[PDB]
Structures are given as structure tokens and as C-alpha cells.
Write a protein that binds this ligand. Structure first.
Ligand code: ZN
Ligand code: ZN
Ligand code: ZN
Ligand code: ZN
Length: 1331
RNA sequence: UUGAUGUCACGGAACCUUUGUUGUCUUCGACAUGGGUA
């Protein structure tokens, strides 16, 4: 009587439940509840908080039971047992309580007489239906009833959308909660079956329960049985108290990238100087110390919790920065061939805009909804029949919907659990060539090689398997399965492997019984013993159809270095470099292997920009167009915001195993001629040379509609031909000569796109002459004094198109060396020495060659001198300071800065009472703490009268200061002898506090502390005879600790310029021609210099130790190379002393004396020192060749560029090291000039060089009427000495007392011809002697 | 913590849109310090 037996439900897939509702909101018309009727429900224990439990209703289990009962009733020949059944009751009285209505067609098994509601006996269908409260279905709450904090703690929200077949754009979306099946695997319940309706009813209920395949949205088997907040606050407080408050976003991104492993925290790089003073990590305790104490924590010894801690701290830092049925089964494995991206938005992570989909077990998940949608899309593609199936109403009667009704799949998850890698994407402005502001967004992807299981089942009134499904599976097995997102970026191309299939008839009694007992072979052991008997074959479709996407193979050759930027890998690196190469990881099992690649987004951007440049729509460029709601060619090919593109670009990977190389660069000041402070920057590009070219191979997928379109193929061929002919560079820093395209070859187009990819004058004679005398000595540099008028009235043109009336092409050049040339390779400073720095000549891939940055600097300097323009590099962060001589104004004082209205108190006078009865009055005075800076530095080998006690007074009773031995770092700390201390009331007057004398005093202590000359303390203003002040009106001027010492200026160096000679500010004032040609920080340059290669055997100054190899020279020892001293160029504090101009060196042959170990000035000897160089040089008469690529250059601009390269017959250039010793005199010869009339033809241009020179000279005389004296000054400075003419050029010596020649030294030149009031006129005249 | 004559929700791809790019010759000459007379 009412015997009850327990039941269990085990879920094999992640099931879903709907959002919880209150009893007032438990209605019929609510859309979310009527949608979630198919899923489980949630229950709240108490309404104050979210504590509750889930449960499943009994009506859903009832519906599954009658569905299975109908299936076995229509499968067992319509009849059951030995008595006639019924079709079933179908009647509803009240329409105001219908929660759900049956909109599905009832399966018809017979047209016999239905049994009535009241008869002698009841059929099994009647008692299962309920026509006989007899059968009760219980609830499925939980096994043992564990309590839970909330719904969010047991599952996760997810959003699913609906797409359109024609456009590919989603138009609607909904969301649902999903929980993991491994967290809640098991649900118990009770059921009351029958009392007196015999055994066939319970048997029918038994195989109806056994036939129940799915429930609650998933396939199931029914059986009858810390410190993150504290660390973030500490880091925030330390960054706030210390300086460098910026770069917090980069630090947070670096910390997020650090979550991969715990061992990288001990491998952070240091500063460029080698000390542990990194700008991003050694700021302070240090940030590195904080992360080190966080690393060696017993709590954070594991991996997943360390990852979660790093994610929380990174999020905190980002928030701070703000015969009938025939069941057919198919199984296989989906393998990734590209990195994929399944979208899943989480509100808890606001740092990355797009987030990949993961399980709470940190494993990658492939949902079944995407598989079902892609199957529907491929079916609609094969049949070419869009369907208008609405969400509700009558079921749709299309062929695709009938094929889909019967398709079941199985969710998959992998074993790879490493965190994803972040990818950044940036826009580029077309009118400028730089990245536009506010275009930063990151997004991560799963790596390639992740393998998923795959299962599929079919149930339909058909003998075998549909031909459309067979064709779709053949397409997937070919390797054209595109299911995940970002397809235009080239993401998510899977290939199905190990296809197995078998059909099972569902009308034979034995096979049906095998189905019921074996439970459909849907469990794990069921799959395990089904796979062995599963057939390994695969059928072939009859009406086969070709796929809609075609693969095109691309090969690119690069005879140049290449780099793709990555700031995050630069921040978390092993070495100190500003820029590194982009590197991506691929997964195989659990390990991830890194490879250098070229980003598909970069290639897509380059190709899109090329097509937009070469195609014009009614005069308006495609770059300038908004590309919104327009039918242009670029939107039709590459897609837009409202449609998907018909072309997909894949990632490109390099061949062989290249290794990165290190190149170092520095900026050169225009005036001083030395390297500007804090301007040394490094670079780590991939190596490339014409001898060993780089092979960039890859592919891209194109649609058949574009392939059959003749005009689209023609435009693509035009763009690919323009890319092939060296016009569009790939990568970054192309101005140095990086990433030039030599050759480009495509395959797989059937010769339909690739078929479109198929006398010099002489230099003018010079006219400037220089008189050279055979007994005079000249200064080894001069200034040109450029003109005070510059042009900024020209508006630059953009890079968005090729403007008419301008020239684009290449220039081949030559270079011959007249003096020895030194181009150093600074990677290794210990070549010759087995410490003294050594250096070596530059060599890329074991080939002697010259980088393009040095040549760019030479041509930029000469072009900047010829065309009047700003100083492109100037150290405006320096203040001058000169020493005054003995000569009345600086009155002594002893006062702080508190207030006003003071008197003439305190005592100060010279002392070394017993001499006079009234004198040496000592009442006020305490222990003195003073700055020890009152002894000379005569050298020529403790403070409080211990180490020194001698005087000079011996015979003449005068001058008692004795010449002491200052060579042990002594007698500066030991000071204050004959102190001007006290004993006369004649000092200490008024003082007020300015904002100018104070910073001048701290800069005076900066000069005193950082003195690199007298080293063989205090940074505050204190008393102790340190208030020697002069005053004007009420305020005061600068103060000094010693009555005769160094004084500092108050005018900065940048105010020594002209009104318009200051560097260009931009941010629109206008641009100078040099900034207009070579570019600024917010403007791309229009020239591209290339690397210069050698032709023949290099001749060296000294042969090497091994005569077999002619590629190695011999060492030569250079002399002392010390810093420039602007204090001689600008003599004093006067307003009339300004800057002379830009510095140029002179041509001479002093290296002949330097070869045989002689100084240029003394001629005695050269000794080993820790402060010189021992390099090797290329001899005179060496040929180099290079190429300059230009775009949209004007005629006069090209003429002046040609003039700046060629010069005249008698001039030369300066290159390399030791320009003061006459090293590196080169001349540039123009060999060939090519132009670009059209994309298909490239013409001559060896002619029209005199025409361009004439237009350039016309522009020069347009700018300046007759004041072209700097041109003759340039020609005089660049004039090369002729034969039988060897002038002597050397720097003056420190003193005359050691000169065999007897020439005047610096101290004699100070009073004489190089007087203070005429030094700026005697230095601004080329070849002016001083001897 | 479902209520007994009617549940195709395995009826719905988080899909499409965006070059980490621009600018810089691994270069080179004049000093450092305070007294000492009337
Ligand atoms: Zn019946
Ligand atoms: Zn349809
Ligand atoms: Zn458009
Ligand atoms: Zn400028």
C-alpha cells in the first residue's frame, strides 16, 4: 500500500536554474519565469539575506515521464500488452490559470477507440496520465540538505545572444545562471507509484524512467536508489609619500602579468647603469622588497591562491589608478589550430574589457550553445535558405529546423589551466601616423593546441544520416570549423579528428532492451565500452558542396631588422630594454612554448591602410570617411560595425630560430657637440640583413564571393603589388631602416590575384676658398651663427594619400671615406683587452655595415644648418656658473630668515686679548659647526688644528699661507684656518627670503658636491659665516659661503636663444622645415634611411694578428676625450653674451701623428689610462651603398636634400668618433633616382636633378635675399684640404711651462687675443688661428 | 516547501568594429680652490 522507493539523479552536464522570485512575483505573464520553467528553482530559508537552497519541481519530471511513455508507446507498434490503449485526454476548462501551453504536435500512433474515463479497467497510459490523486511525484531538493550562503557562491551568470545569418551581428540576448556539475552531482527524491493497477503499469513507468535522457537543460542519468588590501594600501602609501606617482597602470598590468608563476619576482631587471635603481621597481621599503616579503609567505606557497591574490591586488591598483528511430552516434576530438576566444563578461573584473570563459576549476570550457549555433549556421549556409523562426508560437517548418530537432551534443572541458596572456590593440591616426589618444584596450585569448572531446547523436525517421550533416562534418574534418569569436582577427579554427560513428535500430526488441538496460551508453563507463565497439570509419555525402572559404598562402622576405612593440614584456623582463619583440605562447598538454610572431591585427591594419590609400571615392579618401552606413569598397571587403568582413587574416610566424640582438642609441646636442643628459636609450629588435634575410610566412582566408568578383580581386592585387614594391613597411621604427619588404609571394589564387604583381649629372664646382698658413695653429671647432629668421608658416600634409605634384620613390647612394672612420659597437667593451674600455666596429650578421641612425643624424644636422630651422636637440635643463676673480660688494652677515626690523649686531673679523687692552671682545659665541671650504687645492705632494700646523711666514713677515699637500682627498674637509670669525661689530644687516636665491644656493651645493676635478655633505642653508650677502632695495641677491668663490647665474640656458630659434613646441605656432621633414614626437617623418653595406675587402689601418682573415683590423690608442665646456663659449654674466651657434668640426690630418703614439698638442707620448679608448678603424678609400626612401616630397625639398647629400666638389662630411682629431671624412655620391608614376610602372629620374637643384636654390633665395653668409661659413668649415697642404690643428694646452714649441697656453690666451669682450667674434670665424 | 487531464527551451554563437605607432649620430677641452695688503 503506497510503497515508496527512493530515486537519484546524476548530472553529466552543467545544469541551469532561473533567477529567484517571490510569491507575489510568481505569476504567468512574467517572461523570465516562463522561460525558466524548464529549469530548476531556488528557495530562500529566510528573506532577510540570501541563504537558501535549490530544488527541482515534480511537474518537469512528470513531463519527461509522459514524453518517454509516448515514445515507447509509439515505438512498440502502437499497442501495449494485450489491451487497447488510448491516444490520451486533451481538454482544458479554465484558460485563466494556464501557466504553460502545449504548442507541440502530439505523436499519433493509432486511430482506434479511446478508452473512457470510467470503465472496468484502466490502461497504463490512462493511469500514468492521471485519469484513474493516485501517483504522486516528490521534490528533488538536496541530499542531506546542506545550507548555502548565496546563489552566486554556487554558480555563475552567463549571457547568450542570437545572431543574424545575413549580417553576422547579434540583435538580442538573454542570461541565465549555470552551476558546475561536479559541485552538485547528485539529487535525491521520493516517488509513490501504484497500489492496485498490476505490474505492466510499473514496468511502463520503469522504462519511461530509464528512457528519460535529459532534464533541467542537461543530460542526466536517473537511477533507482587575506593581506591583499594591506599590501595594496602599503604600496599606495609608499607611492604617495615618495616621488614618481605616475606609471601605476603599467605597474598594475605588470603585476597582472606576474600571475603566471611565482619565480619571476626574483628576476626583475635593473637600471641601465647596472645599479639596483630601477625607475619602476626600486623607487623606495622598495616595491620589490614588498613583493619579496609577499613571495616568501607560508600562506602564498601554492599556485591558485597566489594567482587569486595577484588578481585582487592588480584589480585594487587599477581601481586606485581609475527500424524507426535509428539512434546514430558520432564521436571525435576538436583540436585548435589558432588561438580562440569564447566571450564571457564578468562584472568583478573591470580591467580587461573582454574576458575568456573559464570554469571555477580554472579550466577552459567549450559550451554546447556555440556548437548548436554554428551547426545551425553551417546548415543554413549549405542549404542557402534563411529561416524566420520567431521565439514562440507554432514551431517552424523549415528543413534546417527539422534537421536540428534531433541533434544533441556534449559540453567539453580541457586539462590546461594556465592563465591567459593579454593582447593590446591600438588605433593609428591616418593624418599623422601616430597612435590616437584614448585608443587603449586589452583582451586575452586561450592558446592554440587545446583539445576538446566531441559527441553528437541523431534521432529521426530516416535510414542513415543526412547528407547536409555529412557535408558539414566533412567541412569540419577538412579544417574549416570556425566556432569561436574574433574570426576576422583569425581566431578559432578547429579541426575535428578521429571521427567514429554507428547507427542503432530502435525497433528490434533485443536492441531496444539493450538500450534500456545499458541506459543509452551515456555514462563514462558506457562511453568507455562503447568506444571499443565503435566503428572507425566515416561515410561520404552524395550531394557534396564546396566550402565557402579558401586559403591563400603568403610569404614575405625582409632584408632588414624587425621589431613589434610590447610594453608589458618590457616591464616584466630579464634585461633592461625600452622595447622588446612580441612573443606568444602555444600549449601542448600542460606546457606552453613561446614563439616570436607577427600580429595579425598589425597585418590587417597595414593592408586596410594600403587599400584605403590606393582607392579613392569621389576625391575624398577612405581614411577620412567615417565608414558608417556606407557601401564603399573598404567596408565591403574588410567589414564595418554593422557587418562581418569577407576576409580573415591569420597570425604570421617567422621561420628558423632567430635570436634578438641589442642596439644602443643616444642623442647629440647641437651646441655643445656632446651627448645630452639622460638621453641614452636601448632597443632589442630581431636581426635582419641582405645576406641572411628573414622569412615571414603565413596565410589568410578569403571568401568565394570576393574571389569571383573581378574588381575586388583587382583592388587586392593593386594593394599587394604596392606592398611588394617596397612602399609599405611592416613593424615599427621604420625611419632607422626597420622592416622593409623585399619580395612578397602568394600562392593558392589560381593565377587570378597574383597576376597583377609583376644618365646622372655631376656635382657643381665650389667657389669658397680658405687661406692656409704653414706656421699657424687653428682651433679644432667653430660656430656658424645661423640666421635669426625661421619659417613656420607652412602647414604640413598628412599621410592619408598620395598628393598630386609630389614625388615618391627611392634614392640609391654611395659613400667613400677620405680619413679613417670609427663606428663603435657598444655591446662589448672588452674586445682587445684579454678596466680599459675597448669597443669594436659595427657588424650585423658578421658583415661590416653602418646603421642608418648615424647617417640620419648627419643629414639632419646638415639640412638643419642649410635651411634655417630650430635646434632639434638642446639641453635646456642646465644652468651656467662661473668663478669670479679677486678684485667690494659682498658684505659679511650672520642671520636666518624669520622676520624684519633687525639691527647691526654680531661680530665678524679676521683673527689667526694680549696685544691691546681693549680688543678681541668675546661674549657671544658657542660651538661652531661650519662648512669646510676655505683652503686652496695646490696639490704637489685633523680639521681642528691637528693635521696642519705650519705657516709660510719665514723671512718676509708676509703671506703666511703655506703650500700644502692636497692629494689624499684632504685639506678640503680640514679647513678654517685664519678664520674671519668675530671681534668687530660691522656686519649682519637686513635679510629677507626670496624664491630665487634659495634654489641658486642649493644648486651651488649641487656644483660643490658634484665636482669631478678636486675629489682627490650639506644641502641646507645654515649659519656660520655662510650669510655673505649683497642686497638691492629691500630684497637680497644670491649668498655665498666664501668671499671669493664660484657664482651661479639666475638666467636659464633656454633664454639664451633667439625669439624663434627655440625648439618647436607643436600642439597646434607652426613647424620649421627640419621638423617638417624629419618629423617630431607627434608627426611622422617622410624619409626612411637604410643600413649601408660594404662592397669589397675592407682595408684596415693596422693589420690583425691573423693574416688569414681580412675582416679584422688592428688596435689604435686614442687620446683623452673629455666633456665640452660651455663656460669658454659663453664668457660671463653679461647680457650681451649669447650663444654663438651650432658647432662644426674641421678637416685635418692629425691622425697621422696619432698613429705613432703622439698627442695632437704635445707630441710627446700617449700612456695607458682608465679614461680613453682603444678602437679599430676603417682606412680611407672604402665604398658603402645605401638607399633613402621618400614619400610626398616637394621638388625643392628633394633638391635641398640632394644638395645636402652631394654638397660640392671639394667638401665632405663628418661621421663617427673623435671629430676633433680629424676622423671620419666621408662624401656621398648619388647613383640613381627612381620615381613612382603609377602602381604598375616605375620610371627614370636620373634627369631633372639640375631642375630640382634650381628650385631648391630659388627657395633659398626666396627665404633669404642676400644674408646667406652662413652658407659660405658652412663651405669654409666643410672645405677639405688639398694635396701638399697639411695645416696643424690642435687644442691649446693647460700651461706654457711644459711646451717645447713655446706656444701660448690658455692662461695667456685669456688676457690677449681671446679677451672676454671679443671671444664670441674670434670663435665665429672659420680657420682663425691662435698661435 | 512541486500539486496531478497538455512544458519542442538541445527554440537563441556575446557576434561584429581598431598597425603599440611616433621623435633622438654611444658622443667629447679648459680648468678646480682661497687668500693676501692697506
Ligand atoms: Zn487510456
Ligand atoms: Zn529555421
Ligand atoms: Zn566604408
Ligand atoms: Zn623645429
Amino acid at each position: 500500500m503506497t510503497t515508496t522507493m527512493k530515486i537519484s539523479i546524476e548530472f553529466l552536464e552543467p545544469f541551469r536554474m532561473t533567477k529567484w522570485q517571490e510569491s507575489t512575483r510568481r505569476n504567468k505573464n512574467n517572461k523570465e519565469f516562463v522561460r525558466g520553467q524548464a529549469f530548476a528553482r531556488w528557495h530562500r530559508n529566510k528573506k532577510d539575506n540570501t541563504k537558501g537552497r535549490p530544488y527541482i519541481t515534480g511537474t518537469l519530471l512528470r513531463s519527461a515521464v509522459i514524453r518517454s511513455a509516448e515514445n515507447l508507446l509509439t515505438l512498440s507498434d502502437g499497442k501495449i500488452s494485450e489491451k487497447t490503449c488510448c491516444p490520451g485526454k486533451f481538454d482544458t476548462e479554465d484558460k485563466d490559470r494556464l501557466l504553460q501551453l502545449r504548442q507541440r504536435s502530439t505523436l499519433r500512433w493509432t486511430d482506434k477507440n479511446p478508452c473512457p474515463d470510467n470503465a472496468e479497467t484502466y490502461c497504463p497510459f490512462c493511469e500514468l496520465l492521471g485519469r484513474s490523486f493516485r501517483i504522486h511525484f516528490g521534490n528533488l531538493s538536496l541530499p542531506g540538505k546542506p545550507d548555502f550562503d548565496g546563489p552566486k557562491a554556487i554558480g555563475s551568470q552567463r549571457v547568450l545572444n542570437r545572431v543574424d545569418f545575413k549580417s553576422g551581428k547579434a540583435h538580442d540576448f538573454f542570461k541565465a545562471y549555470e552551476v558546475d556539475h561536479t559541485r552538485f552531482p547528485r539529487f535525491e527524491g521520493e516517488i509513490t507509484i501504484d497500489n492496485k493497477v498490476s505490474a505492466e503499469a510499473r514496468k511502463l513507468l520503469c522504462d519511461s524512467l530509464k528512457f528519460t535522457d535529459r532534464l533541467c537543460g542537461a543530460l542526466c542519468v536517473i537511477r533507482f536508489d587575506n593581506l591583499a588590501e594591506k599590501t595594496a594600501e602599503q604600496i599606495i602609501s609608499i607611492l604617495d609619500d615618495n616621488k614618481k606617482t605616475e606609471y601605476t597602470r603599467l605597474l598594475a598590468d605588470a603585476i597582472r602579468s606576474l600571475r603566471r608563476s611565482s619565480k619571476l619576482v626574483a628576476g626583475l631587471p635593473k637600471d641601465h647603469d647596472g645599479k639596483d635603481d630601477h625607475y619602476l621597481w626600486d623607487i623606495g621599503v622598495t616595491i620589490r622588497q614588498i613583493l619579496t616579503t609577499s613571495a616568501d609567505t607560508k600562506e602564498l606557497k601554492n599556485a591558485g591562491k597566489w594567482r587569486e591574490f595577484c588578481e585582487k591586488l592588480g584589480e585594487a591598483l587599477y581601481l586606485k589608478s581609475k527500424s524507426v528511430l535509428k539512434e546514430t552516434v558520432v564521436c571525435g576530438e576538436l583540436v585548435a589550430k589558432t588561438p580562440f576566444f569564447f566571450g564571457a563578461i564578468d562584472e568583478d573584473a573591470k580591467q580587461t574589457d573582454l574576458q575568456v570563459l573559464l570554469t571555477p576549476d580554472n579550466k577552459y570550457r567549450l559550451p554546447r550553445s556555440a556548437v548548436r549555433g554554428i551547426l545551425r549556421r553551417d546548415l543554413q549556409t549549405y542549404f542557402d535558405s534563411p529561416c524566420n523562426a520567431e521565439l514562440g508560437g507554432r514551431p517552424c517548418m523549415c528543413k534546417t529546423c527539422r534537421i536540428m530537432r534531433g541533434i544533441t551534443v556534449m559540453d567539453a572541458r580541457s586539462e590546461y589551466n594556465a592563465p591567459p596572456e593579454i593582447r593590446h590593440r591600438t588605433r593609428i591616426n591616418p593624418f599623422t601616423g601616430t597612435v590616437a589618444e584614448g585608443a587603449l584596450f586589452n583582451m586575452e585569448v586561450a592558446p592554440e593546441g587545446i583539445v576538446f572531446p566531441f559527441q553528437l547523436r541523431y534521432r529521426g525517421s530516416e535510414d542513415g544520416l543526412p547528407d547536409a550533416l555529412k557535408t558539414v562534418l566533412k567541412w569540419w574534418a577538412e579544417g574549416q570549423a570556425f566556432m569561436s569569436g574574433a574570426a576576422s582577427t583569425g581566431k578559432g579554427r578547429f579541426r575535428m579528428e578521429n571521427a567514429k560513428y554507428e547507427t542503432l535500430d530502435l525497433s528490434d526488441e533485443n536492441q531496444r532492451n539493450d538500450y534500456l538496460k545499458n541506459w543509452g551508453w551515456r555514462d563514462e563507463k558506457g562511453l568507455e565500452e562503447l568506444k571499443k565497439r565503435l566503428n572507425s570509419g566515416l561515410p561520404e555525402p552524395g550531394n557534396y558542396r564546396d566550402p565557402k572559404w579558401h586559403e591563400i598562402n603568403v610569404s614575405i622576405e625582409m632584408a632588414s631588422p624587425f621589431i613589434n612593440g610590447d610594453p608589458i614584456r618590457a616591464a616584466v623582463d630579464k634585461r633592461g630594454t625600452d622595447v622588446v619583440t612580441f612573443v606568444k605562447y602555444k600549449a601542448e598538454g600542460e606546457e606552453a612554448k613561446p614563439v616570436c610572431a607577427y600580429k595579425a591585427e598589425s597585418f590587417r591594419g597595414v593592408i586596410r591602410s594600403a587599400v584605403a590609400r590606393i582607392h579613392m571615392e569621389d576625391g575624398v579618401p577612405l581614411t577620412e570617411l567615417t565608414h558608417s552606413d556606407c557601401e564603399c569598397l573598404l567596408c565591403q571587403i574588410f567589414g564595418s560595425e554593422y557587418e562581418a568582413g569577407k576576409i580573415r587574416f591569420e597570425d604570421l610566424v617567422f621561420e628558423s630560430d632567430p635570436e634578438p640582438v641589442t642596439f644602443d642609441h643616444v642623442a647629440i646636442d647641437r651646441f655643445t657637440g656632446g651627448a645630452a643628459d639622460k638621453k641614452k636609450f636601448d632597443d632589442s629588435p630581431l636581426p635582419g640583413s641582405p645576406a641572411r634575410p628573414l622569412m615571414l610566412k603565413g596565410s589568410f582566408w578569403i571568401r568565394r564571393d570576393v574571389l569571383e568578383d573581378e574588381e575586388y580581386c583587382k583592388a587586392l592585387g593593386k594593394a599587394l603589388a604596392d606592398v611588394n614594391n617596397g612602399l609599405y613597411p611592416l613593424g615599427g621604427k621604420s625611419a632607422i631602416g626597420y622592416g622593409q619588404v623585399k619580395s612578397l609571394g602568394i600562392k593558392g589564387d589560381d593565377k587570378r590575384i597574383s597576376r597583377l604583381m609583376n644618365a646622372v649629372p655631376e656635382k657643381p664646382k665650389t667657389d669658397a676658398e680658405v687661406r692656409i698658413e704653414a706656421e699657424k695653429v687653428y682651433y679644432p671647432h667653430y660656430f656658424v651663427e645661423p640666421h635669426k629668421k625661421v619659417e613656420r608658416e607652412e602647414k604640413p600634409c598628412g599621410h592619408q594619400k598620395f598628393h598630386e605634384g609630389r614625388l615618391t620613390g627611392k634614392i640609391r647612394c654611395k659613400l667613400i671615406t677620405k680619413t679613417p672612420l670609427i663606428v663603435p659597437d657598444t655591446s662589448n667593451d672588452d674586445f682587445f683587452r684579454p678596466y680599459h674600455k675597448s669597443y669594436a666596429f659595427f657588424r650585423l650578421h658578421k658583415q661590416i655595415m653602418i646603421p642608418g641612425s648615424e647617417l640620419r643624424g648627419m643629414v639632419s644636422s646638415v639640412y638643419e644648418t642649410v635651411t634655417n630651422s630650430c635646434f632639434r636637440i638642446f639641453d635646456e635643463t642646465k644652468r651656467l656658473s662661473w668663478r669670479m676673480d679677486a678684485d667690494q660688494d659682498f658684505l659679511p652677515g650672520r642671520v636666518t630668515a624669520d622676520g624684519k626690523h633687525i639691527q647691526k649686531f654680531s661680530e665678524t673679523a679676521r683673527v689667526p686679548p694680549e696685544n691691546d687692552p681693549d680688543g678681541w671682545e668675546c661674549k657671544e659665541g658657542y660651538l661652531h659647526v661650519v662648512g669646510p671650504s676655505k683652503v686652496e687645492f695646490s696639490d704637489k705632494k685633523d680639521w681642528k688644528t691637528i693635521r696642519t700646523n705650519d705657516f709660510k711666514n719665514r723671512k718676509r713677515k708676509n703671506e703666511p699661507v703655506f703650500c700644502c699637500e692636497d692629494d689624499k682627498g684632504n685639506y678640503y674637509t680640514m679647513a678654517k684656518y685664519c678664520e674671519t670669525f668675530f671681534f668687530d661689530l660691522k656686519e649682519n644687516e637686513e635679510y629677507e627670503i626670496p624664491e630665487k636665491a634659495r634654489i641658486k644656493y642649493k644648486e651651488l651645493l649641487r656644483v660643490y658636491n658634484n665636482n669631478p676635478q678636486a675629489v682627490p655633505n650639506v644641502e641646507k642653508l645654515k649659519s656660520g659665516d655662510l650669510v655673505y650677502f649683497k642686497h638691492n632695495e629691500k630684497y637680497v641677491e644670491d649668498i655665498v659661503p666664501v668671499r671669493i668663490s664660484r657664482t651661479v647665474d639666475d638666467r636659464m640656458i633656454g633664454k639664451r636663444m633667439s625669439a624663434d630659434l627655440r625648439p618647436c613646441h607643436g600642439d597646434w605656432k607652426g613647424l620649421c622645415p627640419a621638423c617638417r621633414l624629419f618629423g617630431t614626437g607627434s608627426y611622422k617623418g617622410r624619409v626612411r634611411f637604410g643600413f649601408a653595406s660594404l662592397e669589397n675587402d675592407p682595408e684596415w689601418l693596422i693589420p690583425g694578428k691573423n693574416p688569414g682573415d681580412p675582416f679584422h683590423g688592428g688596435p689604435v690608442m686614442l687620446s683623452l676625450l673629455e666633456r665640452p665646456r660651455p663656460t669658454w663659449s659663453i664668457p660671463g654674466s653679461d647680457n650681451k653674451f649669447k650663444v654663438p651657434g651650432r658647432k662644426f668640426y674641421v678637416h685635418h690630418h692629425a691622425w697621422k701623428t696619432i698613429k705613432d703614439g703622439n698627442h695632437p698638442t704635445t707630441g710627446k707620448a700617449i700612456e695607458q689610462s682608465p679614461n680613453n679608448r682603444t678602437v679599430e678603424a676603417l682606412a680611407g678609400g672604402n665604398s658603402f651603398s645605401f638607399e633613402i626612401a621618400f614619400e610626398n616630397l616637394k621638388e625643392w625639398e628633394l633638391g635641398l636634400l640632394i644638395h645636402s647629400l652631394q654638397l660640392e666638389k671639394g667638401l665632405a662630411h663628418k661621421l663617427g668618433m673623435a671629430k676633433s682629431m680629424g676622423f671620419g671624412s666621408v662624401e656621398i655620391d648619388v647613383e640613381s633616382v627612381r620615381l613612382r608614376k603609377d602602381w604598375k610602372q616605375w620610371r627614370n629620374g636620373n634627369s631633372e636633378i639640375p631642375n630640382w637643384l634650381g628650385k631648391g636654390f630659388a627657395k633659398l633665395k626666396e627665404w633669404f635675399r642676400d644674408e646667406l653668409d652662413f652658407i659660405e661659413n658652412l663651405k669654409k668649415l666643410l672645405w677639405f684640404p688639398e694635396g701638399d697642404q697639411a695645416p696643424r690643428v690642435c687644442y691649446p694646452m693647460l700651461r706654457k711651462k711644459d711646451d717645447p714649441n713655446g706656444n701660448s697656453g690658455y692662461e695667456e690666451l685669456k688676457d690677449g687675443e681671446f679677451k672676454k669682450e671679443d671671444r664670441q667674434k674670434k670663435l665665429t670665424t672659420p680657420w682663425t688661428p691662435w698661435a
